[PDB]
Design an enzyme around this catalytic site. Structure first.
Site, PDB file in Angstrom:
ATOM      1  N   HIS A 152       0.833  -1.218   0.000  1.00  5.18           N
ATOM      2  CA  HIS A 152       0.000   0.000   0.000  1.00  5.18           C
ATOM      3  C   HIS A 152       0.854   1.249   0.000  1.00  5.18           C
ATOM      4  O   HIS A 152       0.524   2.242  -0.647  1.00  5.18           O
ATOM      5  CB  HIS A 152      -0.900  -0.027   1.232  1.00  5.18           C
ATOM      6  CG  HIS A 152      -1.764  -1.285   1.332  1.00  5.18           C
ATOM      7  ND1 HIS A 152      -1.614  -2.236   2.295  1.00  5.18           N
ATOM      8  CD2 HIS A 152      -2.825  -1.704   0.542  1.00  5.18           C
ATOM      9  CE1 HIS A 152      -2.523  -3.212   2.099  1.00  5.18           C
ATOM     10  NE2 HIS A 152      -3.265  -2.881   1.038  1.00  5.18           N
ATOM     11  N   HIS A 180       5.355   6.777   7.092  1.00  2.00           N
ATOM     12  CA  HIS A 180       5.078   6.425   5.710  1.00  2.00           C
ATOM     13  C   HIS A 180       4.490   7.653   5.037  1.00  2.00           C
ATOM     14  O   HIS A 180       4.218   8.666   5.659  1.00  2.00           O
ATOM     15  CB  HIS A 180       4.066   5.258   5.659  1.00  2.00           C
ATOM     16  CG  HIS A 180       2.746   5.613   6.264  1.00  2.00           C
ATOM     17  ND1 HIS A 180       2.480   5.460   7.581  1.00  2.00           N
ATOM     18  CD2 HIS A 180       1.657   6.231   5.716  1.00  2.00           C
ATOM     19  CE1 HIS A 180       1.258   5.939   7.848  1.00  2.00           C
ATOM     20  NE2 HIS A 180       0.753   6.423   6.692  1.00  2.00           N
ATOM     21  N   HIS A 225       1.736   9.082   1.628  1.00  2.00           N
ATOM     22  CA  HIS A 225       0.698   8.933   0.608  1.00  2.00           C
ATOM     23  C   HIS A 225       1.055   9.903  -0.494  1.00  2.00           C
ATOM     24  O   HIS A 225       1.475  11.028  -0.209  1.00  2.00           O
ATOM     25  CB  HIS A 225      -0.699   9.263   1.176  1.00  2.00           C
ATOM     26  CG  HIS A 225      -1.018   8.477   2.416  1.00  2.00           C
ATOM     27  ND1 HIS A 225      -1.788   7.362   2.387  1.00  2.00           N
ATOM     28  CD2 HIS A 225      -0.647   8.640   3.738  1.00  2.00           C
ATOM     29  CE1 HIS A 225      -1.900   6.838   3.614  1.00  2.00           C
ATOM     30  NE2 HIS A 225      -1.207   7.606   4.461  1.00  2.00           N
ATOM     31  N   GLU A 239      -3.798  13.449   1.709  1.00  6.61           N
ATOM     32  CA  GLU A 239      -5.057  12.943   2.299  1.00  6.61           C
ATOM     33  C   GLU A 239      -5.830  14.107   2.913  1.00  6.61           C
ATOM     34  O   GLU A 239      -6.951  14.430   2.491  1.00  6.61           O
ATOM     35  CB  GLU A 239      -4.718  11.862   3.292  1.00  6.61           C
ATOM     36  CG  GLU A 239      -4.101  10.663   2.590  1.00  6.61           C
ATOM     37  CD  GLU A 239      -4.312   9.384   3.361  1.00  6.61           C
ATOM     38  OE1 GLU A 239      -3.991   9.358   4.568  1.00  6.61           O
ATOM     39  OE2 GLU A 239      -4.807   8.413   2.753  1.00  6.61           O
ATOM     40  N   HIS A 253       3.157  10.831   7.181  1.00  8.56           N
ATOM     41  CA  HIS A 253       2.536  10.482   8.462  1.00  8.56           C
ATOM     42  C   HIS A 253       3.569   9.819   9.351  1.00  8.56           C
ATOM     43  O   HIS A 253       4.082   8.751   9.029  1.00  8.56           O
ATOM     44  CB  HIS A 253       1.394   9.509   8.216  1.00  8.56           C
ATOM     45  CG  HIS A 253       0.215  10.140   7.550  1.00  8.56           C
ATOM     46  ND1 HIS A 253      -0.788   9.437   6.939  1.00  8.56           N
ATOM     47  CD2 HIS A 253      -0.087  11.475   7.402  1.00  8.56           C
ATOM     48  CE1 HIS A 253      -1.663  10.306   6.423  1.00  8.56           C
ATOM     49  NE2 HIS A 253      -1.255  11.540   6.734  1.00  8.56           N
ATOM     50  N   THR A 278      -6.293   6.342   8.309  1.00  6.32           N
ATOM     51  CA  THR A 278      -6.833   6.569   6.967  1.00  6.32           C
ATOM     52  C   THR A 278      -6.775   5.331   6.057  1.00  6.32           C
ATOM     53  O   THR A 278      -7.192   5.417   4.896  1.00  6.32           O
ATOM     54  CB  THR A 278      -6.122   7.728   6.243  1.00  6.32           C
ATOM     55  OG1 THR A 278      -4.793   7.295   5.944  1.00  6.32           O
ATOM     56  CG2 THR A 278      -6.127   9.017   7.057  1.00  6.32           C
TER      57      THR A 278
END
Ligand SMILES: [N]S(=O)(=O)[N][C]C1234B567B89%10B%11%12%13B85%14B%1158B%12%11%15B%139%12B%1061B%12%112C5%153B%14874
Ligand SMILES: [Zn+2]
Length: 258
Positions: A62, A92, A94, A104, A117, A196
């Site tokens: 992911h 990590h 996004h 996000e 994050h 999330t």
């Protein structure tokens, strides 16, 4: 399980396996800067990462996680909205397929190119697994990324990604200093929310920094070379691994700054 970011398994489907996806304190949210209110009850925020000990970097299918040794009180977040001490366990990102999307959280509906994050757990609960059974179990420090100048403190992460291209690959990643990923200002917005990603647990105090960090187009292009798939499987580029903004419901976003 099963869950991901595609048409048939993406954020619109998660509620079937994870009903809390339609819960009362889901994340991310849009941060309406005009409606957020300065909160004089917030204490100074303390990000103490000097003794942080990274262990490993993992492609989990992911995103990628940079993992820390959280067996002693070392890299900790305290102050601000937080009661007590929260220990860093991993970070990590996004990110998007294009520079115009990837974050996000949004700011007045603006999407940044990516979002970092840093995940921490409340040490009053003894372990991360117990912490995620609590409404104040976790604190996530969120940092926006824009594309411009390179972030030199990110380059070591970028350069190891070639070795963890596919799902389930990991590499030793010791001696990484997360202080090199922080902007100058600790001005922030805070609100109560959730993870999330599935399992979407409602345990998080979010602390979202106002000042983005700049990364270079070349740095983010390397994120976009990662794969969601495992080794030997058809290539699906790891891009657009972000959940969009969720309903604010009965929440207020507080600002640390006037
Ligand atoms: N975007 S997020 O930080 O809300 N959730 C990402 C995850 B990965 B795995 B554990 B790790 B910790 B928990 B599960 B998943 B959830 C946090 B990290
Ligand atoms: Zn995240």
């Amino acid at each position: 399980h099963h869950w991901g970011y595609g048409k048939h398994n993406g954020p619109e489907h998660w509620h079937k396996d994870f009903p809390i996806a339609k819960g009362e304190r889901q994340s991310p949210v849009d941060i309406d800067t005009h409606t957020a209110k300065y909160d004089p009850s917030l204490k100074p925020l303390s990000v103490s990462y000097d003794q942080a000990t990274s262990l490993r970097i993992l492609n989990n299918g992911h995103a990628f996680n940079v993992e820390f040794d959280d067996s002693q009180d070392k890299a900790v977040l305290k102050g601000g909205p937080l009661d007590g001490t929260y220990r860093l366990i991993q970070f990590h990102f996004h990110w998007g397929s294009l520079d115009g999307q990837g974050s996000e959280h949004t700011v007045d509906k603006k999407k940044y190119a990516a979002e970092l994050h840093l995940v921490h757990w409340n040490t009053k609960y003894g372990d991360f697994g117990k912490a995620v059974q609590q409404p104040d179990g976790l604190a996530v420090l969120g940092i926006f990324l824009k594309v411009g100048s390179a972030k030199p403190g990110l380059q070591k992460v970028v350069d190891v990604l070639d070795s963890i291209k596919t799902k389930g690959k990991s590499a030793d990643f010791t001696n990484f200093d997360p202080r090199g990923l922080l902007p100058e200002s600790l001005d922030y917005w805070t609100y109560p929310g959730s993870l999330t990603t599935p399992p979407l647990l409602e345990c998080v105090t979010w602390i979202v920094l106002k000042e983005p960090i700049s990364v270079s187009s070349e740095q983010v292009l390397k994120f976009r070379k990662l794969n969601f798939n495992g080794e030997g499987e058809p290539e699906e580029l790891m891009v657009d691994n972000w959940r969009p903004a969720q309903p604010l419901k009965n929440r207020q976003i507080k600002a640390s700054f006037k």
